[PDB]
């Protein structure tokens, strides 16, 4: 378990980091391509920021 817990913790950290890519964070969508393909640059700057 001492060896397996390190692997489990690292996998959990990586999984959380990956899951964080699907959060709006206040923008209109979590996908950057959708923001780029829906809004003009001046409006898309806020969502990208």
């Amino acid at each position: 378990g001492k060896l397996q817990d390190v692997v489990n913790q690292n996998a959990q950290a990586l999984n959380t980091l990956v899951k964080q890519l699907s959060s709006n964070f206040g923008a209109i969508s979590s996908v950057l391509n959708d923001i780029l393909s829906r809004l003009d640059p001046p409006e898309a700057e806020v969502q990208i920021d």
Partner: protein, 98 residues
């Protein structure tokens, strides 16, 4: 006249008399009982602020269903095993299609 603000995208048809005052209206207008609907006044000599404007509101939504409404963009041939920019019903992105 209404009891509370509308929720977004809500429609109300009921013409019940608003009971603004403490006196019950009992379904008939009178003291503190006003008709919920009001008539507009539009004349050819009315000012621009009172001129009637014919307005339309367009709304779009995607429900991970078939893309029924699309644009006049013309589709092209299919390319495999090459790093290309795909666009499947708006699924904009890049990658290798195999």
């Amino acid at each position: 006249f209404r009891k509370s603000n509308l929720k977004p995208f809500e429609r109300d048809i009921s013409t019940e008399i608003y009971q603004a005052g403490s006196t019950p209206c009992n379904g008939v207008e009178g003291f503190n009982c006003y008709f919920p609907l009001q008539s507009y006044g539009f004349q050819p000599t009315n000012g621009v602020g009172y001129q009637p404007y014919r307005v339309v509101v367009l709304s779009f939504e995607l429900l991970h269903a078939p893309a029924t409404v699309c644009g006049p963009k013309k589709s092209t041939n299919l390319v495999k095993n090459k790093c290309v920019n795909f666009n499947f019903n708006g699924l904009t992105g890049t990658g290798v299609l195999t």
